[PDB]
Design a protein around this ligand. Sequence first.
Ligand SMILES: O=C(O)C[C@@](O)(C(=O)O)[C@H](O)C(=O)O
Lengths: 418, 324
Amino acid sequence: SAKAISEQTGKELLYKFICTTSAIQNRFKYARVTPDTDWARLLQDHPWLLSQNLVVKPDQLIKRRGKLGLVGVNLTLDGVKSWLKPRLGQEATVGKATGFLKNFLIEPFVPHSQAEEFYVCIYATREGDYVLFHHAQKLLVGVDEKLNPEDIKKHLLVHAPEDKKEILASFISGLFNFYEDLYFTYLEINPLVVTKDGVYVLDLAAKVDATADYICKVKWGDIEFPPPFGREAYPEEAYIADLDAKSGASLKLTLLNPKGRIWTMVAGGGASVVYSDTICDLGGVNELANYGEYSGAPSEQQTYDYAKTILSLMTREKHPDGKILIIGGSIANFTNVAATFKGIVRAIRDYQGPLKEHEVTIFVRRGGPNYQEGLRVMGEVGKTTGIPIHVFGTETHMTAIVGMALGHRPIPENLYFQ
Amino acid sequence: SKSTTLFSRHTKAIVWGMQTRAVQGMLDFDYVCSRDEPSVAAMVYPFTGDHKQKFYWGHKEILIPVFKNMADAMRKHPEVDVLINFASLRSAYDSTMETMNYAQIRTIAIIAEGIPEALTRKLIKKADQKGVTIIGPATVGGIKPGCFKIGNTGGMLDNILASKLYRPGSVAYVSRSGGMSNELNNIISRTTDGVYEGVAIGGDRYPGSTFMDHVLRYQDTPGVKMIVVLGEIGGTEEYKICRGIKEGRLTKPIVCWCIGTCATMFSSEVQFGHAGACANQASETAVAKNQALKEAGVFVPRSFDELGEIIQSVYEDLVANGVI
Ligand SMILES: O=C(O)C[C@@](O)(C(=O)O)[C@H](O)C(=O)O
């Protein structure tokens, strides 16, 4: 899927790889600030921080930073430090997401008039890439079309100041070629500045198609895909992501609330979402700990490694009301339910101690190849460990176990194993 | 849209990849469907030399040829008009583009997950030029009872039999999820006279064929009397159903549910398992699509839990009026 990158990552790639007749100014003149920043060492690396006034802003996948008052403009370095003191490390809510402001970017202030400010955006659709320009003009570039400077002048630069058409057209042509060569799906510059001295990229947001790593890794290098603002990145998520990378099968894990008492381990991209929907319809959104799925016939070892991650994560801190695990799915097409449930069952064995300390109750519903044996080993692991496990098959509606696990409906023992 | 009919009980396919379990599963289906012949004419696998692979047609051992080069398989099996592509994500683009140099191929299934969206757009552009229907990428495929099943879709014989997938009923469906397509096989078999045809379009941002591509095929297929759609958060494709109904193009009853209602309740953005399952605007949420479809005349259940109930009610109403 498409994943946003930081402004800093995008600018590094842009400054390294863009080919334009234009003279782009302030190349690589940015500095990253975190709560761990050593300011003397920062200044040693970036002496230009003293050479003119500055702009400071977060670089954390926050959009509309200007309209949020999150851009400090035309500040001395002392001004930036003062601007950062009540912001660096603070909670911030943006829209409805809440996270900590922890990563900031400092860049030179470029004095310019409003008539030297331009807007450029490229974004992918089914029918090709739309290029937007504003000083609004928009052009669909079809899948096999080039975007030459003369096409830009013709279709987009009708209203641009005459003395800036050549440099704008050259920049936007190079920008579009960079967009394609590095597998971007979204690239916005708000604003692009053009003064007598050349072109300045004051702002950038972008997404790249992360599935193109095997094509682009040489150019992308060790590219970072931060979590969206409002979530943290966890190492368990990166472990599963690395497993996912190693196989045709799909393994996905996203932590929503690590202290939540409702955990899922559901097969299928579709079913995982339906189970998650049902949990939230029944009032459990604040206790849902995770979204994820496995699918595409993973091996027993893959499922074990996935499962042991989950089981580790739900036995970190106790919760007064105990915890529930929802092991669900559709009637699978070809995922081997016995091989995969054996992997889960082996993880449950290794964690039976913690799982009993944390008062875990497990609900199972699954059909598919060899599902009857998968359901049996689940039943057997419950009896042999003491862990309550309620096991259902094809004759139970897929999501009924959610209502059971949250107390909205009684457990129908007359349906076990069917 | 393109061809109304993709498969029949005479469909012959080439399978790209060494997928003996999926092929044998197709043959088991073909057998209980009372097809004259296996649906797989040949396989293509460049990591091996030309050879022949043993399969079973009922209890009888048969041989299906495996070709190192696509050109040999195409030349030797001109009856083939379907290719099912199990190539890894790394080479699915090149093998699919190559398939589309062969005019005999009218339908391609692309199985692999993880194909870059820009490569899929170019596959879509070539398929649209040539009139080739692409199912996928990132899909188990689909199933047309009595006729043909794509790869692993529908699983083994016990499930083909339990879900009545060996003869068509009157209900067609299209889903973004393969696993859920098999759950729909089950639900529909229990509530109606069964599936007439089902397609899983895959979870990528740009499916080779969309909901509306297949919904239109279903509108135009006499044996189809009602249509079920399992949508999902992300993109705007389901609004084309609303439009089709408003225009009077879609007249058969349509039952639809979009999954991903939970995302409206999360404080932060969540990418779900399908590459396309992420809303970039308010209109792309499942809550918004579900409300729009309901207002447009689509039969929309209160939640997934009530999908079976509304399917059966629509089905029973159609029986009552003599349509089924
Ligand atoms: O295991 C599941 O529930 C999903 C799936 O792997 C299956 O076997 O049905 C599905 O075909 C897919 O390929 O994602």
